[PDB]
């Protein structure tokens, strides 16, 4: 749900069990750590503009199912948390459509050449 509603990416459950479930949380954890370090440096003081786009409460930075420790109503609460985060994702995505759409390329300069006028 997070991937679909934040990156327009659809992935299979099989690939999540095999590849994404381990790699994606690691990448997001590293990015979150880098963002925290950069923020701390700025407070104490564009190239990596894709790193500080990770949200603390919406992104997943933990291995799905926990670590594989082999050789080195919890379910209801997890479902409730999933529903809450899905609602937040839907709220975030709802305003995107009305905000703007890619549509096609037009004469935007001409549109700006006739600005709205409001006066009584």
Partner 1 sequence: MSLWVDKYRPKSLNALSHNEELTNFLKSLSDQPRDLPHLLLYGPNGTGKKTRCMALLESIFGPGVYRLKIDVRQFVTASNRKLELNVVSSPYHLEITPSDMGNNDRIVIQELLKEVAQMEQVDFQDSKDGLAHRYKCVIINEANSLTKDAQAALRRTMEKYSKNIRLIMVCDSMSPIIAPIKSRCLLIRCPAPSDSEISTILSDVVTNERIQLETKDILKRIAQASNGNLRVSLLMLESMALNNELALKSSSPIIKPDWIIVIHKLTRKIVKERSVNSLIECRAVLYDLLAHCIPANIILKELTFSLLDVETLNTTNKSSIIEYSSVFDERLSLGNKAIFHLEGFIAKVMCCLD
Partner 2 sequence: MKLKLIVNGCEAPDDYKLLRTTINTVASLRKTAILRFNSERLTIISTPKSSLNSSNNGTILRGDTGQLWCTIPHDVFRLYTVISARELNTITMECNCDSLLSVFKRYDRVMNQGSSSNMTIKLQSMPEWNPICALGITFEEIIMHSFKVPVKLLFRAQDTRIQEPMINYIQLMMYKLPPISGEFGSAFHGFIRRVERYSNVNHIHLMGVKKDDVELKIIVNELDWHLEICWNGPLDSVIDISVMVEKAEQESSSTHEVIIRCKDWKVCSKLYAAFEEVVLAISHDESCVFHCSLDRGSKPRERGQIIYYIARSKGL
Q: Which does 118 bind (CB under 5 to 8 A by kind): partner 2, partner 1, none?
A: partner 2
3-state helix vs strand vs coil in the chain, percent to 5: 60, 0, 40
CB atoms within 10 A of CB 54: 20
For the CB of residue 54, give the shortest distance to partner 2 in the complex, in Å: 25
Q: Decide if residue 8 touches partner 1 (CB under 8 A).
A: yes
Secondary element (H or E) of residue 85 = helix 74-99
Strands, E, within 6-56: which ranges?
none
Judged by CB, which is closer to partner 2: 69, or 103? 103
Q: Give the C-alpha separation, 94 to 99, whole Å.
A: 9
Does the protein bind partner 1 through residue 56 (CB under 8 A)? no
Q: Give me Rg for the CA atoms of the chain.
A: 21
Tell whether residue 27 is a contact of partner 1 (CB under 8 A).
Answer: yes
Q: What residue 34 binds from partner 2, partner 1, none (CB within 5 to 8 A, per partner kind)?
A: partner 1
Q: Name the residues that contact partner 1, by CB under 8 A.
A: 4, 7-10, 12-15, 17-24, 26-27, 30-31, 34, 47-50, 53, 63-65, 67-72
């Amino acid at each position: 749900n997070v991937s679909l509603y934040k990156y327009n990416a659809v992935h299979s459950f099989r690939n999540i069990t095999l590849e994404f479930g381990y790699y994606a949380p690691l990448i997001r954890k590293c990015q979150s750590y880098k963002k925290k370090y950069i923020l701390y440096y700025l407070k104490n003081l564009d190239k990596f503009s894709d790193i500080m786009k990770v949200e603390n409460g919406i992104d997943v930075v933990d291995r799905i199912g926990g670590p594989i420790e082999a050789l080195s109503d919890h379910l209801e609460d997890q479902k409730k948390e999933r529903d809450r985060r899905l609602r937040m994702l839907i709220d975030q995505y709802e305003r995107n459509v009305m905000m703007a759409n890619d549509d096609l390329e037009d004469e935007e300069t001409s549109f700006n050449d006739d600005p709205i006028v409001d006066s009584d």
